């Protein structure tokens with residue numbers, strides 16, 4: 001039932017809105033610096049905005065996948081919390097990279113800590129789930145000896 | 146249970162098939178205009194096909210995320226319906242852009258209306274869910290005064 | 291409940307880890323061949339690594355979508371099994387393309403067989419679900435004649 005996935009859904013919707021915002025920013029960079037489709041190259045201040053949005057998009061599914069698995073197999077509140085930390089780091093990251101390639105790095109690391117953490121949680125939950133029955137089945141086999 | 150997510154799953158599968166179709170089109174553009182990996186630049190009629198598929202791919206997860214959240218927290222039939230409208234607009238869009246950069250714009254707007262709508266529905270559902278208990282908890286605090 | 295989606299979640303987490311691995315490889319190619327953001331072009335041995343990771347990323351959501359739909363509407367164990375075959379083929383594929391454009395093709399086909407199979411399963415499950423009630427409703431209409 002939806003009472004226990006509603007935080008996860010809320011963080012998920014927040015991520016969509018963020019990605020929508022990045023997209024709108026790439027659209028307005030195209031106008032500002034007059035880079036027009038096709039063509040994803042131009043002035044470097046255009047390319048940084050483009051690349052920031054693309055880098056963010058290529059991680060969105062990873063964040064989602066791992067958000068849901070961690071949220072369901074570990075603990076919904078903790079997952080949602082990393083989710084927010086991740087997304088906020090992704091904001092700071094899109095804004096950094098737009099000013100300066102070098103500014104992308106600090107918030108990239110922040111976003112990596114939060115994401116790696118969700119992975120750790122996802123793996124721990126699935127261990128907790130699969131490990132008991134696996135160890136029991138192994139031990140049953142050792143009977144008798 | 147799966148009886149109430151089956152439309153959403155159906156629209157989801159339709160989207161996968163569409164993306165598969167875009168991919169196959171990029172493969173055959175590579176043959177036709179002899180642009181070969183790596184290399185994502187070449188004749189402009191190659192680049193438009195490439196970029197159409199990529200633009201579509203970068204939105205696929207947004208459509209999915211928001212399709213499921215709207216479908217579950219608002220109303221499954223309405224979500225599926227926007228889903229179809231969105232995907233159909235994405236077809237017209239891939240076909241437009243392939244002929245002509247300028248032809249991409251009309252169906253892009255159509256796809257944006259349908260997607261923004263799913264976002265509106267997603268947000269309304271989550272409001273309906275979180276707002277009652279939030280307002281009650283607030284009011285309980287004002288007792289007594 | 292989570293007892294019947296736990297394999298799917300396990301394969302899902304495996305896919306995230308794989309994508310994380312591809313990403314780390316693109317980062318270290320940037321160092322090795324000194325190609326630095328923005329800029330996604332450089333020596334061809336850089337571009338092949340870049341393109342391998344991107345091609346993989348653009349399919350990750352398709353794999354996920356279809357993995358979950360097949361897993362839930364057909365059979366969880368079979369879906370997870372294709373999932374593994376797919377991911378393993380995607381590994382061999384990232385490693386091939388990095389050495390040589392031509393080496394990408396064999397494992398690309400392997401990954402396409404496994405993915406098309408998940409699509410077949412997804413479609414069969416949804417048929418099994420929608421077709422009975424559709425045919426009944428049709429037949430009820432033919433009464434009386």
Ligand SMILES: N[C@@H](CCC(=O)N[C@@H](CS(=O)(=O)O)C(=O)NCC(=O)O)C(=O)O
Nearest residue numbers: 023026027030037038196197200249253
């Ligand atoms: N990655 C996209 C993000 C923004 C976007 O989706 N833009 C639309 C509208 S517009 O900016 O062209 O008006 C588009 O069709 N982009 C073309 C493309 O992605 O090739 C881009 O580079 O444009």
Ligand SMILES: N[C@@H](CCC(=O)N[C@@H](CS(=O)(=O)O)C(=O)NCC(=O)O)C(=O)O
Nearest residue numbers: 168171172175182183341342345394398
């Ligand atoms: N975006 C892809 C879409 C189609 C695709 O996945 N193509 C395969 C097969 S092929 O067209 O090369 O035969 C590939 O490995 N593409 C290479 C790549 O994505 O760098 C592309 O540009 O090629």
Ligand SMILES: N[C@@H](CCC(=O)N[C@@H](CS(=O)(=O)O)C(=O)NCC(=O)O)C(=O)O
Nearest residue numbers: 051052055104108313316317320327328
């Ligand atoms: N597709 C990415 C994959 C790896 C990645 O995410 N790299 C980070 C860190 S770094 O390699 O630059 O240190 C980044 O911000 N990449 C810049 C970008 O994607 O434009 C890329 O081309 O870089």
